[PDB]
Amino acid sequence: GPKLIDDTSSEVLDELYRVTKEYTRNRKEAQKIIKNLIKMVVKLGVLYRNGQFNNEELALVERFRKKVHTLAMTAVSFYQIDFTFDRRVMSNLLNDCRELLHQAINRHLTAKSHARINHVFNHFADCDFLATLYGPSEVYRGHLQKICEGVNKMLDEGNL
Numbered sequence: 306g307p308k309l310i311d312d313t314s315s316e317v318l319d320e321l322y323r324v325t326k327e328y329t330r331n332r333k334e335a336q337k338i339i340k341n342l343i344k345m346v347v348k349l350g351v352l353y354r355n356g357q358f359n360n361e362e363l364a365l366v367e368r369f370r371k372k373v374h375t376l377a378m379t380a381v382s383f384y385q386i387d388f389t390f391d392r393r394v395m396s397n398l399l400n401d402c403r404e405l406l407h408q409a410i411n412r413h414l415t416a417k418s419h420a421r422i423n424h425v426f427n428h429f430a431d432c433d434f435l436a437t438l439y440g441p442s443e444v445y446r447g448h449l450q451k452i453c454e455g456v457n458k459m460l461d462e463g464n465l
């Protein structure tokens with residue numbers, strides 16, 4: 306079949322894995338978080354690109370795409386412009402995405418997918434994780450720079 310996640314996305318996902326592993330010091334858990342994120346992105350993409358959503362689900366998915374776009378733009382801007390980062394804004398955007406994803410797949414998928422969604426967002430939407438990622442530490446700042454470079458390319462190309 307075709308490759309469903311491109312190289313730029315894979316680099317972003319790897320950097321998200323690296324900050325998650327730095328934050329938790331649990332390589333297995335960090336791998337599980339990132340694999341669950343990938344699995345849900347792939348499932349959502351298969352249903353979306355092959356026209357499997359009904360009208361209500363499609364409204365939810367388009368809302369999800371708009372929220373993700375806002376999240377991506379905000380994440381990049383909070384990295385670029387000093388003294389603008391707000392962990393509550395990021396956490397709230399992420400939890401909006403979580404809820405819309407739960408709703409979009411509620412008819413197609415089961416509790417296992419809801420658990421994958423919650424496992425991912427419980428980590429990434431955590432306010433202390435976000436404040437550490439955007440904080441003064443050199444390791445986090447270097448990874449965040451790579452994340453934002455990749456996200457900016459995805460935004461520019463139209464994939465976020």
Ligand SMILES: CCCCCCCC/C=C\CCCCCCCC(=O)O[C@H](COC(=O)CCCCCCCCCCCCCCC)COP(=O)(O)OCCN
Nearest residue numbers: 314317346349350353373376377380402429456463464465
């Ligand atoms: C602060 C750290 C938090 C980040 C981690 C949690 C955030 C996860 C939330 C959202 C990320 C998932 C977004 C995928 C949305 C998929 C919906 C749908 O399948 O989109 C379709 C597929 O399009 C895509 O490009 C897929 C989207 C990218 C997939 C790979 C993304 C990996 C995750 C990157 C990081 C997420 C953003 C981070 C923002 C801080 C639309 O297709 P099209 O534009 O019509 O044409 C074909 C595209 N070449």
